[PDB]
Amino acid sequence: SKISKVLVANRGEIAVRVIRAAKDAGLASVAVYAEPDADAPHVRLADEAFALGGQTSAESYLVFEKILDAAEKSGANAIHPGYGFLSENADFAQAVIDAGLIWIGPSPQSIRDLGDKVTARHIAARAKAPLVPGTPDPVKDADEVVAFAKEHGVPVAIKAAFGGGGRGMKVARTLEEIPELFESATREAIAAFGRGECFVERYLDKPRHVEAQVIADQHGNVVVAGTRDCSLQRRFQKLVEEAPAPFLTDAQRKEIHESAKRICKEAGYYGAGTVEYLVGQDGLISFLEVNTRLQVEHPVTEETSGIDLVRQQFKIANGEPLDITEDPTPRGHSFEFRINGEDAGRGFLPAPGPVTKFVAPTGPGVRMDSGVETGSVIGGQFDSMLAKLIVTGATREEALERSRRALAEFTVEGLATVIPFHRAVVSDPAFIGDGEKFDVHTRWIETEWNNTVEPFTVPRQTVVVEVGGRRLEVSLPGDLA
Amino acid sequence: SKISKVLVANRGEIAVRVIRAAKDAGLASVAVYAEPDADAPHVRLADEAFALGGQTSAESYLVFEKILDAAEKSGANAIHPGYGFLSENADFAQAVIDAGLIWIGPSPQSIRDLGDKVTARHIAARAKAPLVPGTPDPVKDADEVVAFAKEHGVPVAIKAAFGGGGRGMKVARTLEEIPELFESATREAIAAFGRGECFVERYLDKPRHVEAQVIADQHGNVVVAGTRDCSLQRRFQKLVEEAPAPFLTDAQRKEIHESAKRICKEAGYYGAGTVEYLVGQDGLISFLEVNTRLQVEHPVTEETSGIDLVRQQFKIANGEPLDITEDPTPRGHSFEFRINGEDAGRGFLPAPGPVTKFVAPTGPGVRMDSGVETGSVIGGQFDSMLAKLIVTGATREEALERSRRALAEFTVEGLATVIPFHRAVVSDPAFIGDGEKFDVHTRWIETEWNNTVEPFTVPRQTVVVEVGGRRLEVSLPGDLAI
Numbered sequence: 023s024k025i026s027k028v029l030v031a032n033r034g035e036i037a038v039r040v041i042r043a044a045k046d047a048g049l050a051s052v053a054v055y056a057e058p059d060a061d062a063p064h065v066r067l068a069d070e071a072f073a074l075g076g077q078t079s080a081e082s083y084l085v086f087e088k089i090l091d092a093a094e095k096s097g098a099n100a101i102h103p104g105y106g107f108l109s110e111n112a113d114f115a116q117a118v119i120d121a122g123l124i125w126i127g128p129s130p131q132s133i134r135d136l137g138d139k140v141t142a143r144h145i146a147a148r149a150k151a152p153l154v155p156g157t158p159d160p161v162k163d164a165d166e167v168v169a170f171a172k173e174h175g176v177p178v179a180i181k182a183a184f185g186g187g188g189r190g191m192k193v194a195r196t197l198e199e200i201p202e203l204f205e206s207a208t209r210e211a212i213a214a215f216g217r218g219e220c221f222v223e224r225y226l227d228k229p230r231h232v233e234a235q236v237i238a239d240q241h242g243n244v245v246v247a248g249t250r251d252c253s254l255q256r257r258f259q260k261l262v263e264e265a266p267a268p269f270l271t272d273a274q275r276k277e278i279h280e281s282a283k284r285i286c287k288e289a290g291y292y293g294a295g296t297v298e299y300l301v302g303q304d305g306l307i308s309f310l311e312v313n314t315r316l317q318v319e320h321p322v323t324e325e326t327s328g329i330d331l332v333r334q335q336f337k338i339a340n341g342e343p344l345d346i347t348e349d350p351t352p353r354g355h356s357f358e359f360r361i362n363g364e365d366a367g368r369g370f371l372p373a374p375g376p377v378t379k380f381v382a383p384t385g386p387g388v389r390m391d392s393g394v395e396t397g398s399v400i401g402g403q404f405d406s407m408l409a410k411l412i413v414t415g416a417t418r419e420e421a422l423e424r425s426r427r428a429l430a431e432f433t434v435e436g437l438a439t440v441i442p443f444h445r446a447v448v449s450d451p452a453f454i455g456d457g458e459k460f461d462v463h464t465r466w467i468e469t470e471w472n473n474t475v476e477p478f479t480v481p482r483q484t485v486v487v488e489v490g491g492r493r494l495e496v497s498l499p500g501d502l503a
Numbered sequence: 504s505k506i507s508k509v510l511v512a513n514r515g516e517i518a519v520r521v522i523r524a525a526k527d528a529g530l531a532s533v534a535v536y537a538e539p540d541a542d543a544p545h546v547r548l549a550d551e552a553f554a555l556g557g558q559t560s561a562e563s564y565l566v567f568e569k570i571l572d573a574a575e576k577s578g579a580n581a582i583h584p585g586y587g588f589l590s591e592n593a594d595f596a597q598a599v600i601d602a603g604l605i606w607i608g609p610s611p612q613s614i615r616d617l618g619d620k621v622t623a624r625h626i627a628a629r630a631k632a633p634l635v636p637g638t639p640d641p642v643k644d645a646d647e648v649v650a651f652a653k654e655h656g657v658p659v660a661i662k663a664a665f666g667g668g669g670r671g672m673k674v675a676r677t678l679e680e681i682p683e684l685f686e687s688a689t690r691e692a693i694a695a696f697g698r699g700e701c702f703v704e705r706y707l708d709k710p711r712h713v714e715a716q717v718i719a720d721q722h723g724n725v726v727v728a729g730t731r732d733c734s735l736q737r738r739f740q741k742l743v744e745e746a747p748a749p750f751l752t753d754a755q756r757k758e759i760h761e762s763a764k765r766i767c768k769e770a771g772y773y774g775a776g777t778v779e780y781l782v783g784q785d786g787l788i789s790f791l792e793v794n795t796r797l798q799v800e801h802p803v804t805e806e807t808s809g810i811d812l813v814r815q816q817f818k819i820a821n822g823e824p825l826d827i828t829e830d831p832t833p834r835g836h837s838f839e840f841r842i843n844g845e846d847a848g849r850g851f852l853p854a855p856g857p858v859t860k861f862v863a864p865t866g867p868g869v870r871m872d873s874g875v876e877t878g879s880v881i882g883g884q885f886d887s888m889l890a891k892l893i894v895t896g897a898t899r900e901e902a903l904e905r906s907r908r909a910l911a912e913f914t915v916e917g918l919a920t921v922i923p924f925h926r927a928v929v930s931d932p933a934f935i936g937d938g939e940k941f942d943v944h945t946r947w948i949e950t951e952w953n954n955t956v957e958p959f960t961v962p963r964q965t966v967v968v969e970v971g972g973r974r975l976e977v978s979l980p981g982d983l984a985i
Contacts, residue, residue, distance in 0.1 A: 042866050045908045055974075060967075065974070067912075073972040095971065324867045325806075328835055328897045346897070353809050353834070382863055384871045385523050386802030386893075391866050416809035420527075427526040431548070497969040 025100055025124070025339045026050060030068070031089055032104025034393020035318045035407055037064040040102060043332035052096050054089060056082045058403065063395035070096060073497075078403055083107045086114055090121050100124040100339060102332070109315045110137060126335055128293050128314050136289065136314060139183040140221050143309075149284045152277070152299065152307040156223030164204055170222045171200055177227075180204045182211040183219035188258035190214060193225045226308065228463040229300035231255070232267070233313070235320060236282040237334050238292040239344045244283040247323045247331070248352055249275060252298075254447065256370060256467050262359050262444065265322045266352040268418060269458055274307055285312065292338065294331055296320070303463055318410055321391050322356040325414050355421040356414035359429070361392075362407055363400045365438040367477025374401040378436035380409070383428040387421065388413045400437060408439070418455055422448055438478035446471075504605050505821050506581040508533060511545075512570050513585020514560075515874050515885075516799060518545030521583050524813040535573045537563030539882030543874055551577050559884050564588055567598050574604070581605035581820075590796050591618060591667035607816055609773060609795055616770065620666045621702050623792045630769065632762035632790035635781065637704025645682035648703060652678055655705055661685060663692055664700035666792070671695065672739060674706070709944050711782035712736070713748055714794070715759045716804050718775045718815065719767040722824045727760045728775075728808050729833055731800075732782070735928055736945040737851070743928065746803040746837035749899060750940055751786065758788050760830065766793065774816050784944060802870050802893050803837040837895040838902045840910070840929075844887045844919040848956030851921075855881040858889070859917025868895045868905045881918060889920070899936050903929045919959040927956070 027050030030040040037053060044051035053068035057075050065071050072092035076082040084107065093101065101123060103109035115130040128136060136142055140160055147153055157170055160183070171178045171194075180203050182190030192207050194200040204220075211218050231252040238244040250265030267275050282297050295314035299307055316331065323329055327350035334344070364370040376399045382390035392409035394400070400408070413428055415421035425448050432441055447453050452470070453462050480500045487494045510533040511521045518534055522545050525532040534549030538558050546552045553573040557563030564570075565588060574582070582604045589595040593614045599606060617623060621641050627634045636655060641664045642648060652659045657677050661684065663670035671688040675681040685701065693699055712733040718726040730748035733741050748756065763778040777794035801812050808831045815825055845851040861877045870893035875881070894909055896902040906929040910922055928934045933942045948954075964981035967974070 038866060042908055046904045048904075071974045073969065073974075092972075095973070321867060324895070328895075328901075330867070354806070382865060384863075384873055385520070386805050386870060389866075389870065414806070416805075416811065420811065423527045423529065426529070427523050430526075431523075494971055497972070499966055499968075502966065 025336055027052065027096060027098045027100075028336070029054070029089070029093060029096065029098040029101045030104060031101050031108055032106075033059065033404070034062070034064045035391060035410055036104045036316060037393060038067050039318070039321065039391055040104065040332050041068050043330050046330065047333050047336055049336065050096075050098075052092070052098055054083075054092060056404070058401065062393075062398065064393045072096070079107075086117060090117065093121065093123060098123075100126055102126040102335070103315070105315045105317065124339060126339065128295070129290065132289055132291070136312060137184055138219065139311075140219060142312070143221070145288065146285070146309050149281060149288055151281050151285065151309045152274075154224045154226065154308045157221060160219050160221055161204070164201055167200060167204055167222055168197075171197065174224065176200075177225040179223045179225045180207045180220055181223075182207060182215060183221055184211070184215040184217055185220075190220070191258050226300060226302055226306075228303040228465065229308070230463050231260075231298065231300055231310070232270070232278075232307075233263075233296045233298045233317075234278050234282055235294065235296050235323060235331070236286060237294050237329065237331060237344070238283075238286050239334075239338055240292050240341050241343050242292075243344045243347075244286050245344060245347060246279045246282045247327045247329050247350070249278055250319075250322065251301075252319075253462055253464060254467065255464055260319075260360065261440070261467075262357060262447065263319050264355065264357045264418070266326065266355065268355070268455060269305075269460070270301070270307070271305075294335065300464075318391075318407070319358045319360075321389070321410065321412055322358065322414070325354075325356060325389065325412070326350065326352045354414050354416050355418040356412060357421055357425060359411040359413075359444045360407060360440070361394075361409040361411060361434070362440050363437055364406060364440055365477050366440055366442045366473070366475040369473075370440065370443070372402055372406045373438050373478070375399065375437045377408075377434060379434065381431065381433040381435075382409075382411075383431050385428075387415050387424040388428045408434075411444075418457065442475050446474075506530060506605060506607075506817055508577075508579050509581045509583055509607065510535070510574050510577060510579035510604075511549075511583040511585055512564075513583075513588060514540055514564055515543065515545075515587075516872065516888075516891075517585035517587075518543070519548065519874055520799060520801070520872070521545075521585070521813070522548045524811065527811070528814050528817060530817065533574075533577045533579050535564070535570055535577075537882075539563075540885070542879060544876065545874070553577055558882075560588060567595065571598070571602060574602075579604065581607055583607045584796070586796055586799065587668045591665070593618060605820065607820070609776075613770060613772065614795070617793060617795070618666075619664055619698075619700070620662065620670075620792070621664050621700060624702075624704070626766060626770065626793075627762075627790040630762055630766035630790075632766065633758060633788060634790045635704040635707070637702065641700030641702050642685065645685055648675065648681040648685065649678045651703060652681070658706045659703060660706050661688060662702045662704070663688070663695075664702050665692075665696045665698065669695055671701075707781060707783065709784035711784065711944060712741075712791070713759065713780040713782040713788065714791075715763050715778045715780070716797075717763045717767065717778055718810075718812075718825060719764075719772045720825050721773040721819060723768070724825050724828050725764045725767060726808075726810070726825055726827045727763065727830055728804050728810065728812070729831075730756060730759055734941065734943040734945070735934065735948060737949050739945065741798070742841075743925070744798075744800050744839040745899075746807055746835075746839075746895075747833040748782075749936070749938075755786060755788060762790050763793075774819060775812050784942065799872075800839045800891075802872070803839060803895070806870075807831075807834050807837065835895060836898045836902055837893065838899075838906060840892045840894075840906070840925045841888060842890050842892065842913070842915070842920045842922055842925065844881070844889060845921055846919055846958035847921055847924040847954065848958035850954070852958070853887045854919045854959060855883070855885065855887055856918035857881070858915065860914055861890075861916075862912065862914035864892060864909050864913050866909070868902070869893060869909045887919075889915075889918070892925075898938060900938075903935055923956050924954075 029052045041051045053071040055065035074082045074088045112133045194203040234249045235247045249267040252263040254262035298311040364372045380396050389412040394408040413425045415424045483500045485496050508531045522532045534546045534552035536546040537555050555563040582599045596611045661673040671691045673684045673688045716729040732748050735742045777797050779791035844855045857880045858875045864871050873890040894902045894906050962981045965978040968977045
């Protein structure tokens with residue numbers, strides 16, 4: 023009738039964040055591990071861990087019953103998807119009801135609508151959220167795209183409605199691209215998402231990205247923890263983010279903080295998930311995405327507002343009311359740099375290998391949350407992420423000064439990492455903001471920066487045992503002799 | 504005056520702190536190092552650093568001519584003294600000022616007028632702060648303690664007249680006893696410092712030690728950046744710290760603020776500072792002692808109020824004021840703990856050594872200072888202290904909930920740590936709280952509490968075994984038959 027043991031269905035950098043929040047909450051806290059990670063810190067930090075096995079995502083985390091058996095064998099009443107693998111799967115979200123489990127996530131039906139960026143964008147307009155207005159109709163055929171390309175004008179997005187991870191994000195810049203990019207995005211969408219939907223809207227010339235985090239309770243209250251900027255991206259992947267809102271007006275800020283509640287309440291929502299927007303080069307704003315999950319870059323919420331979002335989710339699972347109610351007025355500034363195994367000398371190409379040391383700085387203003395530990399080995403079969411570096415001060419440039427010390431101390435040994443680029447954007451003239459304006463935007467990375475970096479130069483065995491008529495599997499090092 | 508290259512004339516904890524704070528400001532920073540601590544992170548991080556050729560603090564950091572030769576050979580222009588070696592013998596500051604370097608702090612006279620602990624009461628009374636009764640002169644002879652205790656009734660504490668990193672202390676219960684413990688403390692006193700004086704101010708049954716974290720300005724601004732409570736004490740020494748004072752109303756907190764503003768203005772104080780207080784279980788408050796070079800617990804007092812607590816001195820040297828001009832309100836709650844190499848389960852018998860394992864705290868609500876890294880070795884005559892853990896939440900209990908994981912991930916090996924004891928007090932029903940009160944006080948843990956720690960000081964084989972898909976760690980003798 024209450025939460026007492028909880029399964030954190032995820033690895034690494036979110037895994038230790040959630041398992042730590044469960045340890046602080048005093049819950050029985052359980053992890054799940056793929057075979058290559060059998061020595062990883064994220065598989066060691068939990069109280070209990072269960073094997074998914076296999077070496078690839080299709081063999082491992084994309085497989086459901088391994089979690090449901092870990093649920094039965096632990097007795098865990100509740101599963102938290104974490105992010106990415108399981109947080110919006112409508113069949114798993116009812117399989118948990120067949121299994122008789124609590125669901126830590128969005129409403130099982132609303133998953134069908136919140137994922138459709140057409141009718142969800144109708145909902146955003148209905149909620150009066152900021153938008154570039156685009157077309158109300160999915161593309162009936164390409165000549166409706168050519169009509170929009172004539173009347174509303176190029177550049178026209180041909181972006182997939184169920185796209186993510188940088189997939190299907192494509193834009194046609196000239197009329198010659200429109201047909202072939204619509205075609206190849208359709209041929210992409212039917213492969214990547216099982217569905218053809220994409221929609222037409224004005225592509226913004228030089229936007230930034232901005233987000234907030236939203237929290238509610240089943241009793242019906244809703245509060246918002248903070249607004250933050252995510253502008254550094256490559257191949258549409260996120261590289262660096264900054265918080266609190268550096269440059270928006272109080273009108274736009276207040277709209278973000280109230281519309282977060284509105285787009286909860288009008289959906290009947292009571293969960294969490296980062297809300298995402300872009301800022302135009304002139305200070306226009308457009309809505310973009312209800313990221314209906316924890317992004318790993320949430321943790322500046324503890325330094326600004328104290329809220330444990332996972333513990334508020336536990337309070338919601340208990341049906342407890344919200345406590346943190348009055349404005350946690352934000353102070354200082356913070357950046358998060360994502361630490362990845364990638365060679366900045368050769369276009370940030372990822373590389374496998376061991377890490378001999380992973381230097382997190384010390385002192386005031388610096389925090390680090392990681393899923394990788396000193397002596398790890400890295401490979402591209404899972405996410406390339408290693409850790410999150412969160413660094414903060416009394417002002418944006420003071421946080422960059424503590425960064426200029428901290429990241430020049432921050433070092434990784436044995437493998438390639440992005441720290442050189444983070445140092446560069448910490449130092450070169452374009453990114454320096456005056457306190458109420460800066461010039462940088464998306465696609466700044468593609469051509470507006472200049473790169474100078476030099477590149478980085480036995481099995482297990484199974485023994486079966488029978489116990490009174492049970493078959494039991496036991497796994498052993500192929501090493502005792 | 505306007506800084507251009509800073510030398511920090513001290514070892515350990517404060518050198519890493521100053522070098523990082525200076526590199527945050529973008530200021531060139533210089534270190535001097537002894538033979539057994541030349542590998543510390545501060546000497547590594549300093550832009551230039553120079554050898555003393557000594558082994559104990561006496562052959563290494565305590566020599567002025569060697570420090571000034573290093574300051575020449577480095578080209579330093581501004582001096583930071585750090586803490587814990589030369590911080591009270593102000594004739595070192597006389598040597599610095601005679602050498603013409605900039606001083607990153609309050610002037611020599613502002614030190615001398617408060618260097619004897621006798622005069623702390625004098626200027627607290629000039630400020631008309633709340634204060635404990637006591638004589639203005641020190642103990643002149645063994646009849647004074649008896650004459651005072653005759654009617655300012657027993658028991659009586661006996662304190663050293665001089666403060667800092669090492670001073671004598673005793674307590675005597677009735678008139679017949681006091682001279683023996685006075686003369687034994689006097690023999691240690693005359694071994695510690697060049698003046699023979701002791702100081703008396705009765706006794707308290709429930710003394711909490713409390714302080715104001717204070718900043719003051721040559722432009723006459725004051726910012727009381729926070730308040731703290733030290734109620735866990737052992738052998739009359741401090742152990743653990745917090746960012747607010749708990750369980751006190753505004754009518755109590757005002758006394759901690761408003762006595763410090765008056766003394767700072769009449770002493771002409773400038774920059775960051777501190778004022779100590781003694782406080783009771785019953786919520787009495789009185790002034791104790793000013794602190795001008797602080798016990799170093801900067802991060803929470805910085806990060807609650809949004810001020811860099813060193814760079815304001817660089818601004819004042821350039822002649823700029825403090826950025827805050829009105830009293831802050833403590834925002835959230837935070838804890839600080841210092842970990843030492845002591846066999847807590849044996850009575851805290853010291854044991855420094857190698858930090859053969861030293862595993863970083865990470866994640867939500869935590870910060871970390873360390874002077875040392877895995878594979879370093881402690882010099883055989885330094886103090887037992889190692890590193891600091893910093894923790895935060897909205898309130899006490901949330902910061903202790905966080906500490907119960909954060910201090911358990913802080914694996915350290917090769918030398919002792921107080922980690923198990925900090926885990927205990929992080930959990931103890933007396934030191935935790937729902938918010939209204941706590942019972943702990945300076946004599947409580949030593950005269951009444953139960954210390955249950957297991958202290959620090961054929962091979963075993965270790966294997967990972969998994970049953971039913973459940974992971975386990977297993978270890979067994981490495982020398983078994985069969």
